[PDB]
Amino acid sequence: QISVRGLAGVENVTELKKNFNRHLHFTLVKDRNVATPRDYYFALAHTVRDHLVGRWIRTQQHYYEKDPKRIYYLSLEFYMGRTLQNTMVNLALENACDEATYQLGLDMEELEEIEEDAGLGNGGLGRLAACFLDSMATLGLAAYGYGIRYEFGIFNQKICGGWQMEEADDWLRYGNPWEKARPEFTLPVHFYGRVEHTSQGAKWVDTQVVLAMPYDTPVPGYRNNVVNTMRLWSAKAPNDFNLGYIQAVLDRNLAENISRVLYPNDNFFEGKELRLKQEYFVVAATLQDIIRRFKSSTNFDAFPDKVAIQLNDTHPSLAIPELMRVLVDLERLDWDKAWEVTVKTCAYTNHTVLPEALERWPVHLLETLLPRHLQIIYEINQRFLNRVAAAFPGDVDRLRRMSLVEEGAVKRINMAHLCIAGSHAVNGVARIHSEILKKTIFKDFYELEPHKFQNKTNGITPRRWLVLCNPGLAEIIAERIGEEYISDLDQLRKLLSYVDDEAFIRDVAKVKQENKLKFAAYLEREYKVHINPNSLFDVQVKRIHEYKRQLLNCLHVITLYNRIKKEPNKFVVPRTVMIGGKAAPGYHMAKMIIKLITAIGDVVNHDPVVGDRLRVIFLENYRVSLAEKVIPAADLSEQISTAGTEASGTGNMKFMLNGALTIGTMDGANVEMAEEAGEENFFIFGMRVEDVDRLDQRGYNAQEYYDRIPELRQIIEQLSSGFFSPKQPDLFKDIVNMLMHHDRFKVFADYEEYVKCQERVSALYKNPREWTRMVIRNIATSGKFSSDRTIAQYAREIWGVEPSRQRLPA
Ligand SMILES: *Cc1c(COP(=O)(O)O)cnc(C)c1O
């Protein structure tokens, strides 16, 4: 069909078809008379999977022979999404499989929709890890993703009566063809117990044991025959466990609950024991696995030369004291030597500055669950503060500010401080975020060790986020500049010379229109809700959170609605406002925001006077698979977090690469995106970080904005009076009260500039040709945001390894 999807060779299409039938028969035990679409999906999945194994085996054999430095990316989240299409794209099998299934009388797209999303992540943090794995494989790095195989990933979101309802994500229900259980590599993990101090060294004894069973998932690089591994641990109770008989067996559930479910919090720390167990479980199993692999390749001096451990935020921070524990207690290295190795091995990436998101574990929890680790942490702190005291003599406050131990109601361990002390590199995920780290939260640490601090702006993989979800766009681009850009996104700059090309302008616009038509259709297919494909698609999809300000978007929507009702026969650019995202189950305000959005839709979508001029739709169950559908269809990308709160954002990059213009604040990566494309080609508005600080010093008083802005006042009064909730007039009292008296995110402060900026957007949309030309200017300069660039920087500036675009013999 299309170029970038590879060749549909005669021999390969024939081979695919027979292997497809082979699996349908021998693997699924079905014939064409009783096979269902799901059976066909699995038959295709196994057929494609077969093509991975050969490459997987030799890639691993290759690393064993050459023994390069290994990169271990530790994360409690990996938001992988679907694997079938991504695998075909990276193996250049898409057209062949498309043809083969066509000849078998099947629609491959229909089959791809059957695959369950692997949702082992909450959002941006987990998705970044997924993009990173893809890029590390594409750049030929000997990298391993290590995490937890949650039985239940992020919950599926159902909207009932306008409210979010959660339901278990039983993603393993029908089985997972992409994972290979490796029970032979099961490792023991210890919990509780006590510390015994003997003649030579301390011993952690009387512990309760849980087994960690690994499951390996292949991670194919883009057309380079490299297939790396993502190893996820599953909790298994030992057999002598708790060994009435029946009860003892049933109580195994206790130990195995460790890998049962993903905590559904985004940018929010919940200090529960189960979560701490998950964090140690992944770290303990991973480190033993890492050391085992190393001992094959006694003098750990070379450990840092053969191993790099990247901590995805502080979630796996226990890797530092655990590594010390193993080196000191088990390998018997002197403290100083062990510490040197640990620091040179570990690197930490911070993904937030929000106080409620930082991990601060109660000492009493670590005391009971991990007694030896607590001792090691105290020793680390003791030695670290001695260093601080020597550098800043007499500065007693600095000592208490930098301590890993926070005093107060209950003593807590600041995991971020632990990570900085035990890592040779600490990085932010966007230039502005990394600067904020050095100027605020980690200022004291930056002053003590400036060399440790770096920036590594986030990125997204152009394979899944362009080629896979937007083949039409990838095609028209390849037509003009070739296919090299897929693994070298910077080449998109060449598209700048086509900004005045009438043919190109027309094609870019045509692809967008086709995507919108396809999405508009999907909305009626699976969700039954009519929308106008000619309207501007205004979308904000991301987790529901106060800092992301879906509420600001809501205020604008209501403003648009009120303006139409005031002057019905006045022309306005038609818009379809789409907002989607999940709210953490225990985040009340977030759940109220979802209700507000659907409530606004209830009024707006049924008002005769509005017609098809304005529609408000809440995209149910936003997840990776849905993102792949809506992003390519978007015209306007909403990235409106309060300046200084969105560490980076990555959804923003996805929209930019897919032909949507961006309306946003100078926050996170938005700053660099505007810088790359040019501010004239971006819709920037609102306070900058400095303005937010100025307002805080003075004191934020929402009442002021309410008193000076009639349109804003009207909206608040509509919310308070029950205009959007007739049966329950005071339904949104909490929202109004928050907005008026304790809005940490200054929604009102950016309201005027936001509405004004939105008017500029509507003005440009009225001129199809110029809107599209600006779009081309965005797509052409999105190259910097490829995770290949990000990973190349991590590789050279932190891990000390050189990326390679060399194909392996397949
Ligand atoms: C990319 C992505 C995110 C991150 O979006 P932001 O707007 O940066 O918060 C969250 N969820 C999903 C499913 C994603 O694909």
Side-chain angles (χ1 to χ4, degrees), residues 489-524:
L489 254 212
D490 285 313
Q491 283 195 49
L492 286 184
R493 276 187 182 286
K494 288 193 274 189
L495 290 179
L496 247 26
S497 62
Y498 292 101
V499 71
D500 289 314
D501 184 323
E502 203 55 51
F504 195 58
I505 293 177
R506 183 146 45 221
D507 285 333
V508 169
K510 189 187 93 300
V511 172
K512 179 57 67 179
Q513 188 56 60
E514 286 180 351
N515 291 333
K516 295 173 60 175
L517 283 168
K518 184 179 183 178
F519 189 65
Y522 166 103
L523 281 180
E524 304 192 317

Coordinates of all heavy atoms in Angstrom, one line a residue, residues 489-524:
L489 N 15.4 12.1 13.1 CA 14.4 13.1 13.1 C 14.8 14.5 12.7 O 14.0 15.3 12.3 CB 13.6 13.2 14.4 CG 12.2 12.6 14.4 CD1 11.3 13.4 15.3 CD2 11.5 12.7 13.0
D490 N 16.1 14.9 13.0 CA 16.6 16.2 12.6 C 16.4 16.5 11.2 O 16.3 17.7 10.8 CB 18.1 16.4 13.0 CG 18.2 16.5 14.5 OD1 17.5 17.3 15.1 OD2 19.1 15.8 15.1
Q491 N 16.4 15.4 10.3 CA 16.2 15.6 8.9 C 14.9 16.3 8.5 O 14.7 16.7 7.4 CB 16.4 14.3 8.2 CG 17.9 13.9 8.1 CD 18.0 12.8 7.1 OE1 17.6 12.8 5.9 NE2 18.8 11.7 7.4
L492 N 14.0 16.3 9.5 CA 12.7 17.0 9.2 C 12.8 18.4 8.8 O 11.9 19.0 8.3 CB 11.7 16.8 10.3 CG 11.1 15.4 10.6 CD1 10.1 15.5 11.7 CD2 10.4 14.9 9.3
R493 N 14.0 19.0 9.2 CA 14.2 20.4 8.9 C 14.2 20.7 7.4 O 13.9 21.8 7.0 CB 15.5 20.9 9.5 CG 15.4 21.3 11.0 CD 16.7 22.0 11.5 NE 16.6 22.3 12.9 CZ 15.9 23.3 13.4 NH1 15.3 24.1 12.6 NH2 15.9 23.5 14.7
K494 N 14.5 19.6 6.7 CA 14.5 19.8 5.2 C 13.2 20.1 4.7 O 13.0 20.7 3.6 CB 15.0 18.5 4.6 CG 16.5 18.2 4.8 CD 17.1 17.1 3.9 CE 16.9 15.8 4.6 NZ 17.7 14.7 3.8
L495 N 12.1 19.9 5.5 CA 10.7 20.2 5.1 C 10.5 21.7 5.0 O 9.5 22.2 4.5 CB 9.7 19.5 6.0 CG 9.6 18.0 5.9 CD1 8.6 17.6 6.9 CD2 9.2 17.6 4.5
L496 N 11.4 22.5 5.6 CA 11.3 23.9 5.6 C 11.2 24.5 4.2 O 10.6 25.5 3.9 CB 12.4 24.6 6.4 CG 12.1 25.3 7.8 CD1 10.8 24.7 8.4 CD2 13.3 25.1 8.7
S497 N 12.0 23.8 3.3 CA 12.1 24.2 1.9 C 10.8 23.9 1.1 O 10.8 24.1 -0.1 CB 13.3 23.6 1.3 OG 13.2 22.2 1.2
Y498 N 9.8 23.4 1.8 CA 8.5 23.0 1.1 C 7.4 23.8 1.7 O 6.2 23.6 1.4 CB 8.3 21.5 1.3 CG 9.2 20.6 0.6 CD1 10.3 20.0 1.2 CD2 9.1 20.4 -0.8 CE1 11.2 19.1 0.5 CE2 10.0 19.6 -1.5 CZ 11.0 19.0 -0.8 OH 11.9 18.2 -1.5
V499 N 7.7 24.7 2.6 CA 6.7 25.5 3.3 C 5.9 26.4 2.3 O 4.8 26.8 2.6 CB 7.4 26.5 4.3 CG1 8.2 27.6 3.6 CG2 6.3 27.1 5.3
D500 N 6.5 26.7 1.1 CA 5.8 27.4 0.1 C 5.4 26.6 -1.0 O 4.9 27.0 -2.1 CB 6.7 28.6 -0.4 CG 6.9 29.6 0.7 OD1 5.9 30.1 1.3 OD2 8.0 30.1 0.9
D501 N 5.6 25.3 -0.9 CA 5.2 24.3 -1.9 C 3.7 24.0 -1.8 O 3.3 23.4 -0.9 CB 6.0 23.0 -1.7 CG 5.8 22.0 -2.8 OD1 4.7 21.9 -3.3 OD2 6.8 21.3 -3.2
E502 N 3.0 24.4 -2.9 CA 1.6 24.3 -2.9 C 1.1 22.8 -2.8 O 0.1 22.5 -2.1 CB 1.0 24.9 -4.2 CG -0.4 25.3 -4.1 CD -0.7 26.2 -2.9 OE1 0.0 27.2 -2.8 OE2 -1.7 25.9 -2.2
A503 N 1.8 21.9 -3.5 CA 1.5 20.5 -3.5 C 1.6 20.0 -2.0 O 0.7 19.3 -1.5 CB 2.4 19.7 -4.4
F504 N 2.7 20.2 -1.4 CA 3.0 19.8 -0.1 C 1.9 20.3 0.9 O 1.4 19.6 1.7 CB 4.4 20.2 0.4 CG 4.8 19.4 1.6 CD1 4.9 18.1 1.6 CD2 5.2 20.1 2.8 CE1 5.3 17.4 2.8 CE2 5.6 19.5 3.9 CZ 5.6 18.1 3.9
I505 N 1.7 21.7 0.8 CA 0.7 22.3 1.7 C -0.6 21.6 1.6 O -1.2 21.3 2.6 CB 0.6 23.8 1.3 CG1 1.8 24.5 1.6 CG2 -0.6 24.4 2.1 CD1 1.8 26.0 1.2
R506 N -1.0 21.3 0.4 CA -2.3 20.6 0.2 C -2.3 19.2 0.8 O -3.3 18.7 1.3 CB -2.5 20.5 -1.3 CG -3.8 19.9 -1.8 CD -4.4 20.6 -3.0 NE -3.3 20.8 -4.0 CZ -3.2 21.9 -4.7 NH1 -4.0 22.9 -4.6 NH2 -2.2 22.0 -5.6
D507 N -1.1 18.4 0.6 CA -1.0 17.1 1.2 C -1.1 17.1 2.7 O -1.8 16.2 3.3 CB 0.2 16.4 0.7 CG 0.1 15.9 -0.8 OD1 -1.0 15.7 -1.3 OD2 1.2 15.8 -1.4
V508 N -0.3 18.0 3.3 CA -0.3 18.0 4.8 C -1.7 18.2 5.3 O -2.2 17.5 6.2 CB 0.6 19.2 5.3 CG1 0.4 19.4 6.8 CG2 2.1 18.9 5.0
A509 N -2.4 19.2 4.7 CA -3.8 19.5 5.0 C -4.8 18.3 4.8 O -5.7 18.1 5.5 CB -4.3 20.7 4.3
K510 N -4.5 17.6 3.7 CA -5.3 16.4 3.3 C -5.2 15.3 4.3 O -6.2 14.7 4.7 CB -4.9 15.9 1.9 CG -5.9 14.9 1.4 CD -5.4 14.2 0.1 CE -4.6 13.0 0.3 NZ -3.4 13.2 1.2
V511 N -4.0 15.0 4.8 CA -3.7 14.0 5.7 C -4.4 14.3 7.0 O -5.1 13.4 7.6 CB -2.2 13.8 6.0 CG1 -2.0 12.9 7.2 CG2 -1.5 13.3 4.8
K512 N -4.3 15.5 7.5 CA -5.0 15.9 8.7 C -6.5 15.7 8.6 O -7.1 15.2 9.5 CB -4.7 17.4 9.0 CG -5.4 17.9 10.3 CD -5.0 17.1 11.5 CE -3.5 17.3 11.9 NZ -3.2 16.5 13.1
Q513 N -7.0 16.2 7.5 CA -8.5 16.0 7.3 C -8.9 14.5 7.3 O -9.9 14.2 7.8 CB -8.9 16.6 5.9 CG -10.4 16.7 5.7 CD -11.1 17.4 6.9 OE1 -10.9 18.6 7.1 NE2 -12.0 16.7 7.6
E514 N -8.1 13.7 6.7 CA -8.4 12.3 6.6 C -8.3 11.7 8.1 O -9.2 10.9 8.5 CB -7.4 11.5 5.8 CG -7.6 11.7 4.3 CD -6.5 11.0 3.4 OE1 -5.6 10.4 4.0 OE2 -6.7 10.9 2.2
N515 N -7.3 12.1 8.9 CA -7.2 11.6 10.2 C -8.4 12.1 11.1 O -8.9 11.3 11.9 CB -5.9 12.2 10.9 CG -4.7 11.6 10.3 OD1 -4.7 10.5 9.8 ND2 -3.6 12.3 10.4
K516 N -8.9 13.3 10.8 CA -10.1 13.8 11.6 C -11.3 13.0 11.2 O -12.2 12.8 12.0 CB -10.2 15.3 11.3 CG -9.1 16.1 11.8 CD -9.1 17.6 11.4 CE -10.4 18.3 11.9 NZ -10.4 19.7 11.6
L517 N -11.4 12.7 9.9 CA -12.6 12.0 9.4 C -12.6 10.6 10.0 O -13.6 10.1 10.5 CB -12.6 11.8 7.9 CG -13.0 13.1 7.1 CD1 -12.6 12.9 5.6 CD2 -14.5 13.3 7.2
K518 N -11.4 9.9 10.0 CA -11.3 8.6 10.6 C -11.6 8.6 12.1 O -12.2 7.7 12.6 CB -9.8 8.1 10.4 CG -9.6 6.7 10.8 CD -8.2 6.2 10.5 CE -8.0 4.8 10.9 NZ -6.6 4.3 10.6
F519 N -11.1 9.6 12.8 CA -11.4 9.7 14.2 C -12.8 10.0 14.5 O -13.4 9.5 15.4 CB -10.5 10.8 14.9 CG -10.6 10.7 16.4 CD1 -10.1 9.6 17.1 CD2 -11.1 11.8 17.1 CE1 -10.2 9.6 18.5 CE2 -11.2 11.7 18.5 CZ -10.8 10.6 19.2
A520 N -13.4 10.9 13.7 CA -14.8 11.3 13.9 C -15.7 10.1 13.7 O -16.7 10.0 14.3 CB -15.2 12.4 12.9
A521 N -15.2 9.2 12.9 CA -16.0 7.9 12.6 C -15.8 7.0 13.8 O -16.8 6.5 14.3 CB -15.4 7.2 11.4
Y522 N -14.6 6.9 14.3 CA -14.3 6.0 15.5 C -15.2 6.4 16.6 O -15.7 5.6 17.4 CB -12.8 6.1 15.8 CG -12.5 5.5 17.2 CD1 -11.9 4.3 17.3 CD2 -12.8 6.3 18.4 CE1 -11.6 3.8 18.6 CE2 -12.5 5.7 19.6 CZ -11.9 4.5 19.7 OH -11.6 4.0 21.0
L523 N -15.4 7.7 16.8 CA -16.2 8.3 17.9 C -17.6 7.8 17.9 O -18.3 7.7 18.9 CB -16.1 9.8 17.9 CG -14.9 10.4 18.6 CD1 -14.9 11.9 18.5 CD2 -14.7 9.9 20.0
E524 N -18.1 7.5 16.7 CA -19.5 7.1 16.5 C -19.6 5.5 16.6 O -20.5 4.9 17.0 CB -20.1 7.5 15.2 CG -20.1 9.1 15.1 CD -20.9 9.5 13.9 OE1 -20.9 8.9 12.8 OE2 -21.6 10.6 14.1

